[PDB]
Amino acid sequence: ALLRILKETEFKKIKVLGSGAFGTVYKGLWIPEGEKVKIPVAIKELRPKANKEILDEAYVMASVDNPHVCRLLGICLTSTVQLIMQLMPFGCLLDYVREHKDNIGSQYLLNWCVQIAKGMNYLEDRRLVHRDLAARNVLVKTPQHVKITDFGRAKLLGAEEKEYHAEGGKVPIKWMALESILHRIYTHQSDVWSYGVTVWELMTFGSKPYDGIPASEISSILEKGERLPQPPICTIDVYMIMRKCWMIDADSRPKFRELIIEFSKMARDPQRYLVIQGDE
Ligand SMILES: *CCC(=O)N[C@@H]1CN(c2nc(Nc3cn(C)nc3OC)c3ncn(C(C)C)c3n2)C[C@H]1F
Numbered sequence: 001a002l003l004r005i006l007k008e009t010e011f012k013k014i015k016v017l018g019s020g021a022f023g024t025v026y027k028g029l030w031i032p033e034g035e036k037v038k039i040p041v042a043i044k045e046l047r048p049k050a051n052k053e054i055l056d057e058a059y060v061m062a063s064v065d066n067p068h069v070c071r072l073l074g075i076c077l078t079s080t081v082q083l084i085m086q087l088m089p090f091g092c093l094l095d096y097v098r099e100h101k102d103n104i105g106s107q108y109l110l111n112w113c114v115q116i117a118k119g120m121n122y123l124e125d126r127r128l129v130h131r132d133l134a135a136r137n138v139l140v141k142t143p144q145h146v147k148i149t150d151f152g153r154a155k156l157l158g159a160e161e162k163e164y165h166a167e168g169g170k171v172p173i174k175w176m177a178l179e180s181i182l183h184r185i186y187t188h189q190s191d192v193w194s195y196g197v198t199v200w201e202l203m204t205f206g207s208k209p210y211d212g213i214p215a216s217e218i219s220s221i222l223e224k225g226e227r228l229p230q231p232p233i234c235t236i237d238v239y240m241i242m243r244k245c246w247m248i249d250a251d252s253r254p255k256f257r258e259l260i261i262e263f264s265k266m267a268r269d270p271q272r273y274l275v276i277q278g279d280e
Contacts, residue, residue, distance in 0.1 A: 045083075132172060
């Protein structure tokens with residue numbers, strides 16, 4: 001995987017898919033010059049650094065090549081930065097499980113858990129701390145295949161950095177590990193905490209964590225030992241994996257490699273681990 005530099009004439013925006021503080025995502029078509037091939041893509045236009053700095057960040061970004069992480073295919077630099085990326089036709093996994101909650105079985109849910117863990121393990125191997133893992137930031141290529149993406153919070157650790165020490169940026173409190181809330185510290189193991197919350201979202205078909213509770217009260221609730229409740233469909237074996245992800249000692253938590261193994265085992269006999277009516 002290498003970085004392509006695109007001219008505006010190469011791609012076109014078809015429609016908005018969503019937006020936020022990061023910018024706007026469009027469904028689009030990319031036609032590389034003279035290649036006569038039309039590629040469906042997602043165009044992320046961000047809301048300045050030197051062009052060479054931006055291209056260097058895009059270079060490392062384009063080298064991320066894994067079945068469960070969304071890839072950067074090209075970049076266009078004009079008055080705005082436009083990142084051309086793989087299109088995930090079914091949108092964010094959060095909305096998907098909410099829409100299809102009545103028709104999703106244990107096999108799909110556990111497979112998604114495996115896939116997200118595989119993508120995160122790949123990021124860890126690349127020394128990337130994601131810092132924003134949540135069901136809204138996992139996207140659906142097909143019902144059977146999901147991919148993680150990033151909207152700016154991910155950070156690359158230096159050779160001798162074991163943690164990222166954050167500054168004043170806005171934080172997704174309800175997905176964060178306690179040490180991140182209290183001390184602005186982020187590691188692969190705080191990503192594991194967020195993975196646990198993401199799995200809880202999936203198993204509750206996209207329910208809201210700490211629903212109706214002010215973000216400002218979350219650290220105190222966590223310090224008292226309280227955690228998100230066991231989802232109705234979860235056998236205790238699955239819930240205990242979540243609970244391990246939310247242990248106060250980051251080194252107590254499973255690593256993504258461990259999570260791949262455990263969820264893969266469960267995925268072999270899915271109805272033994274998630275209890276879903278009509279499944280199957
Ligand atoms: C629940 C989170 C959410 O809605 N986030 C929006 C959507 N988004 C995004 N969407 C798609 N594809 C998509 C979404 N919908 C409704 N239809 C489609 O495609 C037909 C993406 N494909 C790729 N990416 C990123 C890698 C850029 C997508 N991002 C992010 C946010 F705007």
